[PDB]
Structures are given as structure tokens and as C-alpha cells.
Amino acid sequence: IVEGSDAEIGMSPWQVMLFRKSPQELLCGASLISDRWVLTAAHCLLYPPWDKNFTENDLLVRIGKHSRTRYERNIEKISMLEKIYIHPRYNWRENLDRDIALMKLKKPVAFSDYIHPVCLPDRETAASLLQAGYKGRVTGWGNLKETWTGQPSVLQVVNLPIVERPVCKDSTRIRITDNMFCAGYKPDEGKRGDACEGDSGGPFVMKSPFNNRWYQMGIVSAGAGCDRKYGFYTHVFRLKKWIQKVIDQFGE
């Protein structure tokens, strides 16, 4: 994350770390939506152009972490992956449309002060909150400054406003579909703050004033990150029926 800050302890209990088994490293961010299901971005797992096709055995998920590198014993929880479910219409050739994936854990994880599922939005919540200017939150262990070509010590958090669809459309050459939305401040505002590549797959959350709960409205698909423009997020509610289909058909 760029221009954010250290997240407070348990400030984002649903934050998940997609950890590459070997070489050992941070793969992406993700989120806990139930004791057995983790949601993330599809491009973190699948991208043929660079022949990236991680199998369940190449990864692990670490839940309840704060520190990026320390093994936080009796706090974090490491789980193995039972199965990965990339959206069937994930468009990696074109524009990461439907950049989403589901991961079923091998065994259910127990919740704690540091491990807790985030809510998925329903129609009204999506209608109420998904408006230009309203702000959502992003968290991750991604990079901090423009990739000079850096890493944070602990989980980073930052708030960003949703951008008007047209403004966003006019900001890129990419065909932004109705399954995505943008967030980020205007280039003039000098008020930066964004998610970088390491933060992709992580959650974009919003706190509902109606019930005081946190909802994941989007998944970090391509943050205008540590780049030299707005970030792109997967529209979770637009892809809600698929999510439930997977969790209903698969999973106990």
C-alpha cells in the first residue's frame, strides 16, 4: 500500500496472506468469508502470458497476521488448500474481467480476536454504498513506494473513494466492464494513497451505517499502485451469485 499506515491489531481480522510455498514469499492478499472459504483475485493464481498456474500444493494461506515476515505463533493460522476455483469467465487475455477466485481450505479455521470473516454485500448494501465519492478501505502487505526497480513491516491500511464510472472509463485504455469499479484520488489532489501489486486479491471493505458491519465490496484487481490513473477492483456483489454457487455445490 502507498501512503497508508500500520493497521491496528485486529483492525482487519479477515485479511489473508496468500503465501508461496517455494520460493517462500508473499503471493497476494485475500479475505476470509467463512471458516472454510477464502476469496482472492484470479490473476494471482492464473496468468498464462507468464505461465503462472499455481496449484493447491504451491500455496498456503496465513490468517490473522499483522507482521509480514514473523511467524506469529498462537495468533496467526496456517491452512492448506483443498481446492481452487477460478471464475469460469475470468478474462486474462483482455482486461482481467471477473478477476476472482475461491479457495476451499482443507480444514475449517477457528475464529479469534485476529481471525474473523468479512461480510459479502446484498443488493441494497451494494446500492447504498457503491456511490462515487463514498470511501472503502484497502489492506495488504504490498509495496510502499514506486517500484524503483519497499516492503512493509506490518499490514498496511488506507482509505480510498470510489471514482465515477465515466471519469474512470476516460482514465484508461482498458475496457472497464460492469464487473469492476474504480477507486483512488485525482492526480491533482496530491492526496495519494493506493494499493500496489502485492496487495492484489486483498479486500476493499466498507462499513455499513445500517448495521455497523464491514462488507467486502471489491477485490484488488489492479491497483494504480506503486505506479507513475486509478485502481481497479472486482465488483463482489455483481459476482455474488457465482460465489454462492461454488460454496453451495462444493464445501460441507
Partner: peptide, 9 residues
């Protein structure tokens, strides 16, 4: 480099 503290069980 950039080492992550060993872990698991």
C-alpha cells in the same frame, strides 16, 4: 534477500 520466519504445525 528477504527471509520469512519458519513456521507451521
Amino acid at each position: 534477500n528477504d527471509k520469512y520466519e519458519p513456521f507451521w504445525e
